[PDB]
Each structure stands twice: as structure tokens, then as C-alpha cells.
Symmetry: C2
Subunit: 67 residues, 2 copies
């Protein structure tokens, strides 16, 4: 499964690299992708909650990476 | 610029769609992409802060989308 996640990640990263897209642009696109998914696959009532858990995970991820 | 953002977004979304990747898997990959970018292009001292602003934007985005 790790190889599955990693492959998805690599594929998405290459997309950003191919466009030589700036950091801010990359984040904006990535954020919109999350927003798109939540709106299209998460019930309106849980959307904010899933968004917040995504955010917490991101924050924790970044923090720990600061090790 | 909107077409530029939208094109990036579409390209990333197609990547997820091609894998028929589940929502949770998509989020995990997307989150890792943000983490990757922050670690590779944002100074260690601002990383958490940029991560939090990304999160706020995401949260606000989702909220407003609930209109």
C-alpha cells in the first residue's frame, strides 16, 4: 500500500514539476484538489470535519518532519 | 492564471481518477504532496505557519462551498 501511496504522490509531484509551478501555485492547486474531492465524495455534513482532520494531519506531519 | 491553476488541478485530479483511488487515499497522497513541497521549498522556520495557512484556506474554502 505504501508503494501505492508513494506512486500516486510521485505522479502528482511530477505534474507540479512539469509545470515548474511555484510553491504558492502548487499549494493552491493541491488545496483545490482536496476541496474538489470533499465536495464530490464527502457528505456535506462531514465535509468541514474531514477538512479539519486533513488539516490536523498536515500540521502534525509538518511538525514531526521538523525532527 | 485561472486557466493555469485549473489546468494543474485537472491534471492532478485525472491522476487520482486514473487510479480510481479512494477518497482517503487521495487525501493522503494530496497531503503528502503538500508536506513534500513545504519540506523542500519552505524554510523550516515558516513551514508550520505555511501549513497552517494552507489549512485555514482549505477550511474556509470548504465552509464557503457550503453555501
Amino acid at each position: 500500500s505504501n508503494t501505492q501511496v508513494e506512486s500516486l504522490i510521485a505522479e502528482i509531484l511530477v505534474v507540479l514539476e512539469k509545470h515548474k509551478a511555484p510553491t504558492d501555485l502548487s499549494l493552491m492547486a493541491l488545496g483545490n484538489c482536496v476541496t474538489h474531492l470533499l465536495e464530490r465524495k464527502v457528505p456535506s455534513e462531514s465535509r468541514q470535519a474531514v477538512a479539519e482532520q486533513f488539516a490536523k494531519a498536515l500540521a502534525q506531519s509538518v511538525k514531526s518532519n521538523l525532527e
